[PDB]
């Protein structure tokens, strides 16, 4: 199934390097710029989006009117929301780097996050554009055997659940 996953435009915590999950941070001016550049670069297909502001706003500026789904939200970092990556305990850094065995207090475990994301994708019966988050794109890319790191405001097209089709980044 052809699915286009879009990582929302940048927020302040991107350059600040803070874990951004359910904290509802808005897009920065540049984030909105990145969003607008996406208009015309993404296929005209049904759209779905995380209900978090940064995702919804990216979808809007990109020219879409998505149906909202909390299932497309970034992982919930719990007590680690807002924590600087730099000062993150090595045990957490390792879990996030290896993408396994991560369960922050008051947050969501990586395994539960993957289950949530993959169940949502499984329900898509036709090609669509998904406005979501870095961790969601990473979960999908990693499950397809590839590095899941993509720039804010960029997109990836995949043939789910088989392979990555293309990675799109604009300047």
UniProtKB/TrEMBL annotation:
It comes from Thermus thermophilus (strain ATCC 27634 / DSM 579 / HB8). This is Alpha-ribazole-5'-phosphate phosphatase. It comes from the Bacteria. Substrate binds at residues 7-14, 54. The lineage of its organism: Bacteria, Thermotogati, Deinococcota, Deinococci, Thermales. One of its GO terms (cellular component) is cytoplasm. GO terms for molecular function: phosphatase activity. Keywords: Glycolysis, Isomerase, Plasmid. InterPro entries: His_Pase_superF_clade-1, His_PPase_superfam, PG/BPGM_mutase_AS, PGM_Phosphatase. SUPFAM superfamilies: Phosphoglycerate mutase-like. Coiled coil: none annotated. Gene3D superfamilies: Phosphoglycerate mutase-like. SMART domains: PGAM.
